[PDB]
Amino acid sequence: ESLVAARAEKVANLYRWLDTDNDVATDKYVPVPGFERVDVDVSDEVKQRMIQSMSGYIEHTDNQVPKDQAEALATLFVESTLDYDWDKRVEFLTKLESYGYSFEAPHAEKSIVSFWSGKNFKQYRDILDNAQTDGKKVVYDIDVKGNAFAIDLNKHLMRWGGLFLDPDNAEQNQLKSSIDAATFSNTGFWSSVYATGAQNDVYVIAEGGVRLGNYFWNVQLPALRQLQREGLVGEIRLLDKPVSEYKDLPADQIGRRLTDAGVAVKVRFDALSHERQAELLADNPDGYKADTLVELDVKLSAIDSMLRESLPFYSLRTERNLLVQEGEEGFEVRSWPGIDGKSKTILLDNPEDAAQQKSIERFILANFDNFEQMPDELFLVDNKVLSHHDGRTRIIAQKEDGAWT
Amino acid sequence: QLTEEQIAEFKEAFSLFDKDGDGTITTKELGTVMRSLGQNPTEAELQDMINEVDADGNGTIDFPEFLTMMARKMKDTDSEEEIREAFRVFDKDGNGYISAAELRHVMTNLGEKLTDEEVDQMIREADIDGDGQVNYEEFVQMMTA
Ligand SMILES: NC(=O)c1ccc[n+]([C@@H]2O[C@H](COP(=O)([O-])OP(=O)(O)OC[C@H]3O[C@@H](n4cnc5c(N)ncnc54)[C@H](O)[C@@H]3O)[C@@H](O)[C@H]2O)c1
Ligand SMILES: [Ca+2]
Ligand SMILES: [Ca+2]
């Protein structure tokens, strides 16, 4: 069974899950989130040129493709790309795998699969590797050769549209845009395929803050959230501060959650609201390209505050990695995301009462660091909190405030 | 200053963290206690507050010092307009609607400890229209209430 094929299958399911509302997916087309399909209108004449130019690029360049198939791979690559053909896209990757290109992290189980946005991300590698105790090493997708080769062919086809198409023809202009879109959809796909392989804690280099509308936001973060929920990834550690701010910290205290308060928020111009576009073009009509990163005075952290208040015992997830859910007889507690078999019990006097939920919430915060520390059963009854771990104890009672023992 | 009802809420919560009833909490636990009362200081703001209280290096905060701090961060934050602006940044046209798909993307991204099911539930139970659109101000309302 092919490694990259199983990755792609997982990505397909995530993409179809993100598309659950738009319902635009077919048997053949799976949409890349944030990367709309722009249909390609090409004659077979034009296609076979693209193919041969690509056949050429492979033929005489340093790579591991058998020269027999130089032309077959080209044809597959452009067809997969230009027809947005999901099956063929996977086939391409499978074939690269069959020539000895790995889509796995180079250091195996000691790889810290990590992510970047912006140009300075390489200078974070050394501070991060030296913070590790066990010889774990940071990898970026640029370090994995399968992704690197594919991204290479992908730049070729993108550039070929710049050279062989006169933009003064209306069609061939539209065409160059198509290539670009299809080209971007590839980069997205392969980004998710990389992200899907992440394990344990991971690093995201985003100096000066989280970026909305880019590859990490569109195709990598959703995949990381999936892996957290399967218990495969732990903490997503964002680094938004200069390298110097991470000195003399262990690996566990470097970076923070991208929904923590005080994380800055940059957005591509081409992802801003009309309201904010106008504002900026008023003062500077010319200094706003598509990729121009605009800092916004917004707190992404607010969304997590909302959830804190909307969902019972959410804060116990964020704070203590505990999942507390409605149960057959009251509340069940688990190690988030509730995936190991182990289960302890919270029983409440009045389980529907908000104030009683918060009381036991805050008691758990104050008394337990994690699941393992908790008694098999925790009661709150007539304003006493009790544990039951073969013996029963009432460790606190309320009389306008909380006293202990 | 604060309301007496707020001082009360703050006391009841604090007291659970004051684990031998001397009127102090651990400095390590400040963020936690503030957050559980609906205030969300940055790591910078937390450090500031700690330094002001911990010159002597015992690493504890009085209950009056804790009220000062809650009061301070309460002035800075309007929870309502912070939640609005967050969602508004994904509203291309600014009419107060985004696509359901766009709302699924935002919530899966900006939900640290959601399950996939809870996201499904959020979108299921939202009032999506024939365009496939959702009023996020209403969405927030429903999630809050
Ligand atoms: N290895 C690569 O060459 C490569 C390329 C793209 C994306 N990625 C993956 O994604 C992340 C870096 O990309 P990013 O966008 O998050 O960071 P970024 O903001 O630094 O953008 C990096 C590149 O992506 C382009 N880009 C960003 N958003 C785009 C969009 N919506 N449409 C078209 N092009 C867009 C930018 O123009 C730039 O060329 C990394 O985590 C990496 O794994 C890798
Ligand atoms: Ca002190
Ligand atoms: Ca809108």
Residue numbers in the entry:
A (entry chain A): 1967 to 2371
B (entry chain B): 4 to 148
What does the paper say about this structure?
Multifunctional autoprocessing repeats-in-toxin (MARTX) toxins, secreted by multiple Gram-negative bacteria, are primary virulence factors that promote initial colonization, dissemination, and lethality in a wide range of hosts, including humans. By doing this, the clinical strain V. vulnificus MO6-24/O generates a MARTX toxin (MARTXVv) containing four effectors, which are arranged in the following order: domain of unknown function in the first position (DUF1), the Rho inactivation domain (RID), the α/β hydrolase domain (ABH), and a Makes caterpillars floppy-like effector (MCF) with a cysteine protease domain (CPD). The data show that DUF1 acts as a RID-dependent transforming NADase domain (RDTND) that disrupts NAD+ homeostasis by hijacking calmodulin.
To provide structural insight into the enzymatic activity and potential substrate promiscuity of RDTND, we next determined the structure of enzymatically inactive RDTNDE/Q-RIDCBD/CaM in complex with NAD+. Overall, the NAD+-bound structure is similar to the RDTND-RIDCBD/CaM structure (root mean square deviation of 0.97 Å); however, the RDTNDLid shows marked movement when bound to NAD+. In addition, the 2″-hydroxyl group in the 2R-ribose moiety interacts with. The di-phosphate group of NAD+ forms hydrogen bonds with S2083, G2084, R2177, N2180, Y2181, and F2182. The 1R-ribose group forms a hydrophobic contact with W2082, and hydrogen bonds with D2107 and E2186Q. The nicotinamide group interacts with W2082, I2117, T2153, and Y2181 via hydrophobic contacts, and with D2107 through hydrogen bonding. In particular, residues W2082, D2107, and E2186Q are critically involved in maintaining the stable conformation of the nicotinamide and 1R-ribose sugar. Unlike CD38 and Aplysia californica ADP-ribosyl cyclase, in which the catalytic site pocket has no spatial restriction with respect to cyclization of ADPR after hydrolysis of NAD+, RDTND has a smaller and narrower pocket due to the bulky residues R2234 and Y2181.
